[PDB]
């Protein structure tokens, strides 16, 4: 949660200072998003230690607010490349698949396909997720 501790976490990012600025603003507004350092595997099988933001974002739907659980991975060349985004349902939820979420919880949005720094950033992304998940929730509670 400390601005200096974060510099350490992303110390081998190409755009270290950009990445920290975005993360600081994001986690100051969306207080349930925690930065976490974990291994990420690419299609070829190579792994790199990367930061992600994990936790919930508040999404209004039919008059109530839900805390939808997500994980966003910042690649080490962030912000030139988009974050890779997942819904992370608990055992009480199930994924509703569609044009925007596959059965593994991967999220597909036009905002992600069309990413371009600096017209695109983490705040604008989260804003888009809230609107989209507010029309079509990606997780529903189980019976």
């Amino acid at each position: 949660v400390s601005e200096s501790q974060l510099k350490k976490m992303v110390s081998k990012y190409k755009y270290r200072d950009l990445t920290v600025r975005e993360t600081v603003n994001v986690i100051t507004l969306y207080k349930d998003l925690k930065p976490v350092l974990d291994s990420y595997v690419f299609n070829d099988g190579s792994s790199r230690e990367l930061m992600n933001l994990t936790g919930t974002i508040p999404v209004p739907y039919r008059g109530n607010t839900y805390n939808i659980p997500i994980c966003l991975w910042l690649l080490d060349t962030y912000p030139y490349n988009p974050p890779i985004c997942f819904v992370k349902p608990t055992s009480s939820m199930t994924i509703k698949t569609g044009k925007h979420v596959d059965a593994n919880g991967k999220i597909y949005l036009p905002y992600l396909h069309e990413w371009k720094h600096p017209q695109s950033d983490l705040l604008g992304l989260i804003q888009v997720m809230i609107v989209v998940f507010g029309d079509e929730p990606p997780v529903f509670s189980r019976p």
């Binding site: 349930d32 936790g55 919930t56 739907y61 039919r62 109530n64 839900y66 805390n67 939808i68 659980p69 349902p89 608990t90 009480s92 939820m93 929730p137 997780v139 529903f140 509670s141 019976p143």
Partner: peptide, 9 residues
Amino acid sequence: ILPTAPPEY
């Protein structure tokens, strides 16, 4: 905060 999701009817 606890994760919640809307009920399906």
